[model samples]
Target: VAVADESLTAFNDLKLGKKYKFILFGLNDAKTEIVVKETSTDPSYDAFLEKLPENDCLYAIYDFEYEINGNEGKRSKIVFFTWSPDTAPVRSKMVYASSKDALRRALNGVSTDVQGTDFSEVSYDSVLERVSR
Candidate 1:
């Protein structure tokens, strides 16, 4: 299923054999519903686990399935949502590091390798020599 925004990253990741696990909280909803839309076959898509508590934390997995088309990137898409809340905005927060100092260490990893020339026009042999330099 297509999410409202242009969040095709999750779909691309799934195409690239990436595993996704989400934590959902059903604040006022009755039953949380998550769906995967595969238009080709019957709608035997996976279902969200039924646990709708105020502070309930539920997660589900959608295994990766890749189907190649002529130009369209991904054939199918998956999305998660809740039942009662009318599919409201799902607030998301991603953990970057354990401690504040870890951010500094992470920032140090800037790409240092500078491009010397347009290797797209050059041969692989020349690129191999330039990379060694």
Candidate 2:
């Protein structure tokens, strides 16, 4: 399956995997969807669930059979974004990584740390507030 984006004039070609999840957030609304492949679960499922910040953001999850043995197994990528007009004119993608450890390192590289959880619910307002900070 391919998720094509006309805005980018590009598409991600995806092999059928063990699972998939996608979410989109806006100023007023948010949307989410998921797909799980039949049978056995991906090993990294727990890692992802543990690592993801329940913050409001646009994100995606996928489990792909990357190796012949399928033990090289599931690799998932997440991208975070927010829009703050006073800080920036457009939505800025703040983070993208395959792991939480990687995401933390990237945040450090950019001279920032995870902010306090002002809102537990994931929503456009919540994410935008974080970005504005």
Candidate 3:
């Protein structure tokens, strides 16, 4: 659980103003493990969070156990949560996939509008700074 919390915090911190790709790992003692690859790092990340109607959160879950195709059949999973105000309860979409690319494609299939948002792009620090409002 501590690892999962740290992963979330690291993700939020990274989303602050830096646009870079990274991976997050979440592991439990008995079951439930995760590996989140930041396939999309751009201003649209903030935009997507902002468009989540107010006082809401988005929880995106990805299970890579059965779809393990990397590093010789190693299973991984991810549960991504995005709170609009940085204080909202955890609730959002969950996707299960075998690989990061599959997870990315599944996330894009959520909504047409969301798909339109450039998941990968470059910009000044303007967009990330406005996510908390």
Candidate 4:
């Protein structure tokens, strides 16, 4: 149930400062503390997808970028992902799911959440659709 101090700050820095394009989070080896797992300055969707694996559970926040009509132009959302691929251990997914509230409560102003059990569930279009709604 413990969370890292930096983990809490990283969200604000990323959301307001745009310091990092994405931040990945997960429980530590001890499974007692939620901590920063990975991050990048690159804002590419390709890079963001690469951080999530096929057989693991992870939590991530991506400064999602997209475009609509030229009149609408470009825009972004602070999208969060609750990533638990079906191949991941069920036990781990359970823990990740249960503790998600802590992260959500800690990170302020998160605009959207993607509960992805597979690639399609967290795809750019799918996430964008959710944000739009």
Top candidate on TM-score is: 4
Each candidate's TM vs. the true structure? 0.20, 0.21, 0.23, 0.92
What is the full ranking by TM-score, best candidate first? 4, 3, 2, 1
Say which candidate scores most in lDDT.
4
How close to the true structure is residue 8 of candidate 1, measured as C-alpha lDDT? Answer: 36
Superposed on all Cα atoms, model 2 deviates from the true structure by an RMSD in Å of: 16.5
Comparing 2 and 4 on lDDT, the stronger one: 4
Model 3 earns a TM-score of 0.23
What would the per-residue lDDT of candidate 1 be over residues 9-123, giving only the tens digit for each residue? Answer: 3334443544343222211232222222221222223222222222322221223223445785743333222222222224311111112122222222222222212223122
Instruction: Give Cα distance to truth, residue 115, candidate 1, Å.
Output: 47
Reference-based lDDT, residue 85, model 4: 97
Give all candidates' CA lDDT scores. Answer: 0.27, 0.28, 0.31, 0.87
Give candidate 4's error at residue 132 in angstroms.
2.8
Worst 10 residues of 3 by lDDT: 108-117
Clashing pairs in 1: 1-77
Model 4 alpha-carbon drift over 4 Å, by segment: 68-73
At residue 6, candidate 3 shows an lDDT of 45
Q: How accurate is candidate 3 locally (lDDT)?
A: 0.31
lDDT tens digits, residue span 1-133, model 4 = 7778989889888988999999999999998889999989986677788779889999999997777556898777898889999999989999998988888888888888888999989877888888776
